[PDB]
Structures are given as C-alpha cells and as structure tokens.
Write a protein that binds this ligand. Structure first.
Ligand SMILES: CC(C)(C)C(=O)N[C@@H](C(=O)NO)c1ccc(Br)cc1
Ligand SMILES: CC(C)(C)C(=O)N[C@@H](C(=O)NO)c1ccc(Br)cc1
Ligand SMILES: CC(C)(C)C(=O)N[C@@H](C(=O)NO)c1ccc(Br)cc1
Ligand SMILES: [Zn+2]
Ligand SMILES: [Zn+2]
Ligand SMILES: [Zn+2]
Ligand SMILES: [Zn+2]
Ligand SMILES: [Zn+2]
Ligand SMILES: [Zn+2]
Lengths: 517, 513, 519
C-alpha cells in the first residue's frame, strides 16, 4: 500500500479529480415542439439538409422570440450551408433588448449520422465552447437522433469539453471557464431525459480511465494504481481485494510474477467485485491488462517507431475495467455478478528482470518458454485468465493493449476482438454498436498453433508467423480450458495520436455489455 | 500473339506450360467402406484417428479381404503406432497371393471434425509416402468423417501436392490408379472429376506464378492467356499500348513505363449458350515482376526475390477461366480481366510524386511507386464497370500488411456490398480456401485527400490494407464490388512454391451463384 | 554449495539434471556378421550402400539364419528399392518359427567411405524409425565399411538423437515415449569394435550432459546453480574441486572477469575441477570454458536484428563442453596425466552496477584494458582464466568458447575454428577432430592486426575498430594473456547450437576428451 521512492520528490499517489466541472453543469431537456427560448449564453442549432450536399441552412424550430425568429428567417440563413463540421456565430438582440449569441453546426446531408460524424459535430461544437467565456449553452436538435446516439452526443461533449490540468503548474490555462447550465431542445423530450444522467456516468467512467492512462509511469505505478482501485471501490461500496507478492507466490503465478521481477514496485493483483441484490443470473469477469510502463524488458523498445515514450498507456486495459467498475458500481445493474480483475506490474530492465529464454510456470501448471520479454502482456494475462476461470464465471472478457500489429490490421479506429465462443463475441459486437466504441471480429487461426510448440517447455510465448494479434490470442486461449472467453485488443485505438490524449476506450463498451446482458 | 522482346538471344520467348499432367492419367474409383477393403495391389493407407484419446493408439476397424494383411492390421500390432496428426508408417509385405504390397496409415489426430488445414497435413504425410513409391496403385481408406466438400478438397490437395513442376529442371513413378474406401461412396463419386478440374485450374495458376519473370513477362503471359482461350473456345481480346492510350488508362500505363515489355490488358470472356441472367467481372493483379520502382524494395524482408508472385491475382483469374470454360456453367456471363505489366527502374520510369490520370478522369498523386497494384487495378475496375456487370470481384497480392493482420493462411476480403461479401464467404467455405471479412473504415478516407491531385495513392500513415481498399473503392461508382487481398496467402513459404490461392474460391463463387 | 538468490520464491534454485538416462538401461550386444543374422523381436535394420551406383538397388549380402527371411531379402525382391542416402523402408514378414518380425534398411549412398556428416543423416534416418514405434529391441546390421572411430560415432549420435529432453515439460509430456531395452549390432570383425561400445556410452552422456546444461534456461542455469552442478559432478566422479567466490577473486585481482559480472544479481563463481592419475604425472593440461549463463550484451545491448538474444543461454557451451569432458575423463580415467577443468562463470546484465563502455579495468596479470564494447565480455572473462591457467604450471592450455558471431560468417554451423600460439598443439587438436568426428578448422592469428588493439590510455583495447575480423582480433587479445605456455583457442559460436533441431549439440566434449586421452 505504501509507494516506494528513489528520491523524496517522487510522487506517492495518482492525482485524481473526482469532482469535475462537468458535474457542476445543470442539464435541462425541453420538448422542441414547445418552442425555444433564446435568452442567455450561446444557442446552437444542429441542422442538416438530406439529399442536398452542402445544402442551405433552414431553421425549422419555432423560436419564442420575435426578434430572434426574424434573424433566423430562411432568407437570412441561405448564405450558410450545412456541410458536416461547419459552424457559424451570430450576434443579435432579442425581444427584451438583450444581446444574445446564436449559431449552428452542420450535420451533413446523410439522415443517419455515423459515430465518427457525430464525433465531428461535437468536436466542432467544442471549438465554439473554447476561447469563449459563456455561462450557458443551449443545443437545439433539428436532426433525428435515437436514445443511444443522443447519449453518445452528451458523453462525447462532456469528454472533449473537459481539459486535464492535473500536471500543469505554471502553465494552467488562465482562460478556462466552464459553462454552468445546459439546455437541450429535442423531439420527444420525455424519452431522452433519462439518457442525461446515464451519459454523465458513462462520461466520468471514461474520463476516470483517461485520468489513469494520461498519468505518467512515475505517478501511476503498480502500487499507486492498486491504491486508486481500492479508493474507488471504497467509494462505490464494492468488495475489493489486492493480492501481494506472497499470495501470488502461493497461487504459483510464475508468468505474472516474472514480468514484475525487474521492477522496484511490488506486483499487485486488483480484484474488485460487484454483486447485485437478489438472484444472480450472470457471473462475469472483466480482465484488464495493467502494465504501468512497458520498456520491453531486455528486448528493449529501442527500434525506430516503438513508441516507448507513450508506453505508459500499457495499463489502458486495466483503466477501462476500473472505469467500467465505476459505471457498474454507480448504475447498479440487477441479476449480475461482476469481477474486475487486473494483474498489475511494470516491465523494466534490471539485474532482477526475467531474460529471453527463461522458462516460467503459469498458475495452471503449463511451462512457458519466453522468446521475447516485450510480449509480457500475454504472460500477465495468462495467470489472470486462470485466476478468472477459478472464480467460476459464465463469461471471461479481457481487454488489452496487447499487440502493435493492430495498427497494421484495423488501424486507430477499430478494436479487434478474438474469442472461443461466438455467442459471447456477438454480445461484445452488440455492445460495440450501442456504446459506439467500434470493434471488429478477428479470427483465431488454429493452423498457427504449431508455431507455439516449444522444444523444451510446454508452449512458446511467441512464434518463430508474423500475425502477432492472432498468435497472441492462440496463447491466451491455452489458458481458458472450458469457459466462454473473449479477447479485445485495443493497442491501436487506445491512444488518440491526433489529440495527444487517451480515449479511455472500453469503459462504455464493457458497461453496455454488463448492463444489456 | 505478340513478339516478346529480348535483350540477348538466350532470353526465353515463351512460358513453358504442361497441360497433360500425370494426374490426368490416374484412374480413380470410389468404393463403399461397408463392404470391406480389398488389398491386392499397390499401397494401402488407412486414415485413422482416436477421439478423446490424444496421441492415442492406432486401431484398424475395417475388414480387409486378405489373411496376410489382416494379421498385420491386428490391434496388438497397430497399438504400437499412434494417431498424432501427420504421423505415418508403412510396411512392405506379401499378401495371400504372394504379391508384394505396401500397407500403412496416416494419423488424423483426435478431433472428429478435421479442418482443411488438418487435411493438408494428412495429405502431405500421404504424398511423402508417394514420392518414395514405385507402385502403380494407391488405396486410401477413410476411417474418419469427411463431407463432400472436404473429400473433394482432399482430392484437389492430394493431386496438387503430388505433382512436381520440372519445367525448369534439366526415386518414384506416378500411380495409375487411386482407390478410395469411404462411407456413401456413390455420393462422393461426383466429386472426383470436379476435383480433377479444380486441380489443374489451381496447378495452371501455380505454373504461371512459379514461372520466373524472365520467362513470364507481360507479353508472354498475355500470349499464354490467348492460347488457353483458344483451347477452351473462349472469346478473347488483348489490348495493346496504342489502344490503352485511346482508352486513356494513364494510371495503368504509368506503372509499365519503365519496362522493356509493353503493357498488355487481358480480356477473356465466357458466355452461356442459354439466356444470360448474371454478368460477373473477375479482375486479377498482373505485375509479372515488382522491383518496387524508384521506391525500390531494398529494406530487409521486402522479399524482392519472390516478386514474380506479384501476378498471382492474374493467375487465379486465368485458372478460374479454365475451370469455368471446362465445367461450363449456365445462365452466366463471366469476364476475366487483367492489366498486365512489369514494375521496373529506368529512365522511362514513373516517379514518386508524379500525378497521373486514370481512365475515369480522376487525377492520382503517386506517393509510393511500390504501391503500383492499386494503380493498375484502378483502370481495370473502371474497365470492368463499363462492361455493365452485376458483380465485380478483384483479387490481388496488394498489401504486405496482410502478413501482419491475417498471416499466411487467411486472405482478406473488402467490399461495398454485404451480399457480395457473404457470397464470397460462402464460396470460401465450399472451396476450403479460407477468407476473412475485413472492414473498409471510412474515417481513413480523409487521409487520401491530396493537396493538388484528386486523390492520394497512399496514406500519410498504417492500416494500409484498408487504405488500399478505400482507394480502389473510388473507382467503382455504382456496382457491387469485392476485393480479395492474397499477398500473405499466395506463396507457400515453407514449401517454396505457390498455392494457387483463389482459383477454387472464384470458381465456386460463379458456380453456386 | 552456495544458495541461489531469488527475486521471487518461484525462481528455480537448481538445474534439473538427468544422470540415469534410458540409454544407460540399454544392453548392447555385438555379433560377427559371418556368424549369420538372427531376426526376431523388435526392428532389424540393415545399413546398405551401392558403391559407384548412384541410387543403386538394395542388395543384402549378410547371411540370415532364417529360411523365410532370406527368401524375402533375396535380390529380386530388394531391387525395387534403392540406396539413396537417408532413404529407409519397413518390411513385415513371418519367420521360420511362424513369428512376425520387423525388418528394414537405411540407404547409405554410393560412397564407400562415409563422412561424419553423412553418418549423421543415416542415424537421423534411423531414429525416425525408432520414433512413434513402441519397439523393445533394435538390431543394426552393418553392410558398410566403418573404422573403429566411425563405428563409435554411430553409437554416440544414435544415443544422442534418440534421447529426448523433457526436464522442462509439465502438461505436454510425450505419453508415447518408450525406449528400447536392447541393441544388437552385427558387424565384421566384431571383437575389434566391442571395445568402442562403452566408450560411446560414456562419450554420449558427456555430450548429453553438456547439452542438458546448455539447453537449460538462464533462470535455471545461473552462475550459482551452474557451479553447484560442477561440484555435484566432481563429487560423483571423485574429482578435486574448488569454487572461488568474489572475495577470493578480489584477492587474486581478477578485474576483467569481475567487471563483467558486476551488473548481475548472481555472484561470480570460478569453477576449478582437477583430475589426477594415481601414477606418475607426465602431462598437465588446462581446459578453459567460457561460462556466461546469459549474455544480454551489457549496455551494448543485443538489440540489433538477428542478434539472437533469446538464444543467449547458449553462451555456456564452452563451460558445458569442459564439464562434459570432465565426466568422460573422470569415468574413463586416463593414465599419467593431470587435467584442470576451468571456467570463469558469470552473467552479463544491464544494471546501475553494470560496467560501462569506456571503462578501464585491470586484469590479474597487470595489463589494463579499455572496454569499447560490453558485448565482448567473453574475452575479458577468458583473460583472467588464461592467467589463472598459466599459473597452474601446465603443459597445454586449451580454451573453448562461443566467442564471436563472425564464426557464422567464416566457417558456418558445422566447423569450429581453432587458433593458437603453438603449431604442435594445434595439430594435436586437429587429430582429435578426426578421431572424435567433431569438425575443426585451423584459422590464423594475423599479427598485422595487433596494432589495432593499441589503446591511447590503457595497455590494450578490448576490441578493435578497423578490422571487422572479430574472431582473429579476439584471439590476438587472448594471446596477450598467455606468456610462455602452448595455448589454443576453439571458437564454437557457430557450431554449438543446432538451429534446425532447435537444440544444443554438446560440441567440444568428445573433441577435448579425445585430446586428453591420446596424449
Ligand atoms: C511484436 C511486439 C513488438 C513484441 C508487440 O506487439 N509488442 C506489444 C507489447 O508491448 N506487448 O506487451 C505492443 C503492444 C502495443 C504496441 Br502500440 C506496440 C507493441
Ligand atoms: C506498403 C508497401 C510495403 C509499399 C506495400 O504494401 N507493398 C505491397 C506492394 O508492393 N504492392 O504492389 C506489397 C505487397 C505484397 C508483399 Br508480400 C509486400 C508488399
Ligand atoms: C563482434 C560481436 C558482434 C560483438 C561479437 O562477436 N559478439 C559475440 C558476443 O556477444 N560475445 O560475448 C557474439 C558471440 C556469439 C554470437 Br551467436 C553473437 C555474438
Ligand atoms: Zn510489451
Ligand atoms: Zn505491453
Ligand atoms: Zn509493389
Ligand atoms: Zn505489387
Ligand atoms: Zn557478448
Ligand atoms: Zn558472450
């Protein structure tokens, strides 16, 4: 529990903001058929023109202001078009002789917005929120949107609006000022009002994961990460258990323990549990890869393009699980039992580190020949999956930044899912649709299994086939004997390279999976 | 036919092709296993397994009508051998008639349902025994469960691996008879001659791919396509440089600028005798050699010595043309297309940064001369859509990223039409040529926005297989279109030979449509 | 013995060693071919060739004491088969007593004198017949010409390849493993070859023992656990032993050897085994083996492509070969000779305590060395070991080491290179290469390259810069640490590991033993 230090200036805990400015925003949803009030702050219309690409802007909503309504006549709006991402600011006086701000955001010509298009709309909307000291924002929906995408709008809006300044000191933004009120005019308002607070939950779950990922490896260490998981569990009244080295040794987790041998931080196994009141119909284990830093070990990440400066995100799998734990622990689903697991450690270079060629024994008795110390994720997951299966669960779902090969297969937008059970895989895909975190199904090709046959050990850690994502899945499959299991590789989608910040991918995906099961 | 240019007189002027293979001379009969096996001649191999008992002992269940062989096949003798997948034993002995015979087995593991990859290992083990056999007859006894498709796949694979290409060469003898004992023999009899057609179609493609680039050039390959067309009574048309210029195929012509061999566009056609209800275009990548261009393949692992394989798309299409022209499906019209050229470094060569104009009017900024396949296919796809077909399916060794995504066993399929995707996947199942559906992610489309041209050839930077699909997608306007990337599965690296991947897949596609 | 340090309790504290192998339970019987062949239980294999006739027909010349089998193996029936090297066939038939017997052959090509490489292909072909078949007896009939050494090499290679290492198997132990209990050998002039049998069984395990160590991973085989194995072996053979720790090494001022191991969690251990004859000693020999239990390369990390860092447990081979030699010598017990088995064991790791590139260190003989590359750690350890060896007052010093990767580019994977300062000793090793059938080639120490080892500040450079012939330069470095004794250096970096078979060869054991025996 006590974080070790090299010097006194070393941080002993992860700075975490629980009360974010977003939580201070009062959100009201009105019915658009009742008319719009344009009084204070900025009012933004989400408009489109179906079939007519770059078509003119037309405000259909009734505005309860004679002056504003005249400004928004079709003749005045014709000069502007609805191209996706386009935004404009209007300045005018209303009926009560007050200066007001109005605008719009282009939503293209397609009636059904993609999750990427809606992301483009929101990102465009946030630009109007930045560098402007507004106290209230009003969004008028003049497009058709369902409950999931409406919730997705709010989640994305909240996430992008917030700015992480935990590690700023002399460069804190002197102009950062968040809105205090949020008004939303939309079709059939009563059906959408419930999505508001669910969005706020999904938001913080994602951003909590984001805070964990963005934190550097000197702040976020195997100990400090475990201490944070406890504090989270304590706040959510979740049962929690942190396994130390001695307990791991008794469980004979040689693969997981080997990875952390070269670290100054002791290995920590995170075990959070949520149990519903009443009869449990489904028991689920969510496993997150929690490598606080990945140097690669003696197979050091020194080659060009190894992205070692980023490798602090190698616990994004764990972060997604903890973020999910917040959401599950907050919304409190029924008839489910969830186990949040993470074999947390750090992959470093030392006299104590494990070497390429070392043969280690997993907690299930299988001997493993290490061919590459930078393939440490599958080793920690190996023991983690064995632990998970011993819990006697119905579903085992792991999430990990496992292979860099994902950048060559699916890229930076779609995560890959592997599994031994098509039913569970379909459940993940359905969750991907409703959570709007895109996932593509990839195969576990059994023909490659022969390349993992070790001459001396029971199995090789790596192949010597270049299809790393599939070969890694073959390895993990060997540690789930008779349980439905799925493996989500998020190595390519976890980090937003364009925005230079985490996505917190997985929180919404896993939560929708647990809730809609 | 056109005259192939030469640098020296010793330069070959034709691709050697073997049409009459020893496989075509093998008489194949299928017997029902319920009647017991007759072991009087040649080599007899039992395909056995042991379900639930991993690496379990061998036990021959079938009754054999020979006392000498029956004593050999008794359980006490066979239990000394195990059923580990691929494991083989065979013994020489005299039968009841004092004739010299050979009897043995191939282990088929402990799984009741064999994959196509498992069947490959079984066949390879079987072929090893054959390449060491002088006997005239091989008898295969199925004491395992296989359906019609897997049995035909067994025959296709056996025939293919058995055959050895010695065209460029300067022990054993091939068998004359093949006996097969299997449950429901009458049901599998129909698969025999279909397998033999799928055989040569795959092997013909293999012959073209294996043929080096000094033998297989744009002109000689087009000549081979013509000769094949004449044998199959197919309508054919070979477009030359002057006509390609008239059709304004700038993207295609730019790739072949640096070659000593003129660009040649292959157009074969199969038309049904009855009313035509479906028109299909099959498009093959036809780079006889890919040096990479001025973006030379110089980096380690760029595999420049294998770059004769860069035609595999063309070979697969031409191989399908054989199967289609032989089996002669009804109510369908199929167009076999291939923009064939050579990718070389010269003063006349296309350069990185060059802006070229495709036959559809789109200007393309070349960011990498080694991404030439999508360029040649671009004009090919524009040609294909002009034919007014229902389905367009292109197959190509397009991106090396496939080796990092699906590997060397599974090919990737991309497309703009899900129903067409499903038809390819269904064809993958029946042909036993494994293919996996990969997404065309539209969020990556923006990375192709050129500052000066209409579109970029390549991306700034990662998912190159998806980016390449996004590029090809820009050249099919209103037709169901699918794209098969076989760069990873085309070459059998372990065996040092082609697979002929795609031939059976494409044929099953047009047959079961 | 020392206690092996651990990071976690699950870290192994000893090298698993199998002394009693199934090969040791095999009874070997040798018969003269002129007496006729008996074909009964198990598998009976004929070794046939056809001199001058490439892929010629099979012809069994030996008399078979069975009417049925003799008819089966008549020339008319065997014509259909050929003698192509490595080709093998299985025969099934009933003998005179109405019993079913298994007979077969292995093709030995068309050359009358088989090379060592050809013989291994024959044996490997023979082993395939032993695998996946539950035989109780193997019978080998020699219808080819072999000398006493080649006959012994056959048995050694057969025993070695037949054996399977399952020390590190757990849930993937081969359930079908069942070794033969009897081995029959039919050969002309049998009594002359019978003496080679037990020599082969001793040479086999000596090779396999070294192989067991080499194949053993670095977390199992560390400087402490490896030295412990040497003690255990010496005790079983009643060899004198001394294991020097850091304190003793510090007192002997072995700065070069100690500097390599600075960055390791495992303390340095210097292995010193001694065999003395019970009679007057006429010859004194020191055998030095490189003993790096793992070579990460140091701060000159093995990060370049093809640097094979996952293999770097194999950096043991020299020490393992010397220990394997100690077994053969301790078992066969040669006369009038005293052998010193030496190895400076340590581990080259990256740490805060690690030695740096540029560091100047002092060897035990006073020479100062400027470190230009931490991955050239072998010659540094050998430097102190060669000084130690020469202080023993011996007649010959022979070192064996996986020293330079340049050997893969020079001699390849089959032939080891030998360097030296004494021509007569070099020729003795070459003769040992002949009799042991472990291929060794003589490579030159080119003195013109010595000037590139001239350090600006230290007495001598660890490595060169302008040569790129690392193997020769490494020898030039080592020569500077042997003042006035015949010394030879065997670089086995290329031949130690069998890449195709993914296993060690145990190269050096038979070579060094033949060297000690015939001297
Ligand atoms: C093949 C290899 C380079 C070893 C790899 O995929 N490494 C993982 C990794 O660090 N596993 O622990 C990896 C994962 C994500 C990214 Br981005 C890069 C590399
Ligand atoms: C990104 C780049 C390395 C240029 C590539 O995808 N090359 C293709 C190619 O040359 N297509 O024409 C490629 C295709 C197959 C193989 Br194997 C390697 C490279
Ligand atoms: C010149 C250099 C490439 C540094 C070399 O010879 N290295 C040794 C070595 O690491 N000695 O300690 C070496 C030895 C064996 C093999 Br395989 C590769 C490199
Ligand atoms: Zn890693
Ligand atoms: Zn990692
Ligand atoms: Zn190319
Ligand atoms: Zn190409
Ligand atoms: Zn080294
Ligand atoms: Zn070394």
């Amino acid at each position: 529990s006590e974080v070790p230090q090299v010097v006194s200036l070393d941080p002993t805990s992860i700075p975490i903001e629980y009360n974010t400015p977003i939580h201070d925003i009062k959100v009201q949803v009105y019915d658009i058929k009742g008319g719009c009030n344009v009084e204070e702050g900025l009012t933004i219309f989400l408009v489109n023109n179906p079939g007519k690409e770059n078509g003119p802007v037309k405000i259909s909503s009734k505005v309860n202001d004679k002056q504003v309504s005249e400004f928004l006549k079709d003749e005045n709006m014709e000069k502007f078009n609805v191209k996706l991402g386009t935004s404009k600011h209007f300045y005018m006086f209303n009926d009560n002789k007050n200066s007001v701000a109005v605008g719009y955001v282009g939503c293209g010509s397609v009636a059904d917005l993609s999750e990427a298009d809606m992301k483009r709309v929101v990102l465009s909307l946030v630009t109007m929120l930045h560098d402007n000291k507004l106290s209230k924002l009003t969004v008028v929906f003049e497009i058709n949107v369902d409950k999931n995408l409406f919730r997705f709008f709010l989640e994305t809006l909240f996430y992008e609006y917030m700015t992480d300044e935990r590690f700023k000191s002399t460069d804190k933004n002197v102009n950062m000022e968040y809105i205090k009120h949020l008004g939303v005019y939309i079709n059939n308002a009563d059906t959408y009002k419930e999505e508001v607070e669910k969005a706020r939950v999904y938001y913080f779950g994602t951003y909590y994961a984001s805070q964990l990922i963005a934190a550097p490896s000197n702040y976020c260490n195997p100990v400090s990460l475990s201490n944070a998981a406890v504090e989270l569990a304590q706040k959510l009244n979740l049962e929690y258990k942190i396994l130390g080295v001695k307990e791991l040794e008794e469980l004979k987790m040689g693969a997981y323990l080997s990875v952390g041998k070269g670290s100054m931080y002791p290995n920590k196994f995170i075990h959070l549990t949520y149990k519903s009141k009443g009869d449990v119909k489904k028991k689920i284990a969510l496993v997150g890869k929690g490598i606080t830093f990945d140097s690669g070990g003696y197979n050091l990440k020194a080659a060009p393009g190894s992205m070692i400066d980023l490798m602090k995100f190698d616990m994004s799998g764990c972060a997604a699980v903890l973020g999910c734990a917040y959401c599950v622990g907050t919304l409190k689903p029924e008839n489910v039992e969830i186990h949040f697991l993470s074999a947390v450690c750090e992959n470093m270079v030392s006299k104590n580190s494990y070497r390429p060629g070392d043969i280690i024994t997993a907690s299930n008795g299988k001997t493993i020949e290490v061919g590459n110390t930078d393939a440490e994720g599958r080793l920690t997951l190996a023991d983690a999956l064995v632990y998970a299966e011993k819990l006697g669960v119905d579903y085992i779902v792991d999430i990990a930044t496992l292979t860099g090969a994902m950048l060559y297969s699916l890229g930076t937008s779609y995560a890959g899912v592997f599994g031994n059970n098509e039913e569970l895989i379909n459940k993940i895909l359905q969750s991907s649709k409703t959570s709007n975190e895109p996932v593509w199904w990839l195969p576990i090709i059994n023909e490659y299994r022969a390349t993992l046959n070790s001459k001396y050990a029971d199995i090789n850690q790596i192949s010597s086939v270049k299809a790393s994502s599939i070969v890694a899945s073959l390895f993990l499959k060997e540690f789930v004997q008779n349980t439905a299991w799925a493996h989500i590789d998020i190595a390519g989608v976890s980090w937003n390279f364009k925005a230079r910040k985490p996505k917190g991918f997985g929180v919404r995906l896993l939560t929708e999976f647990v809730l809609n099961d």
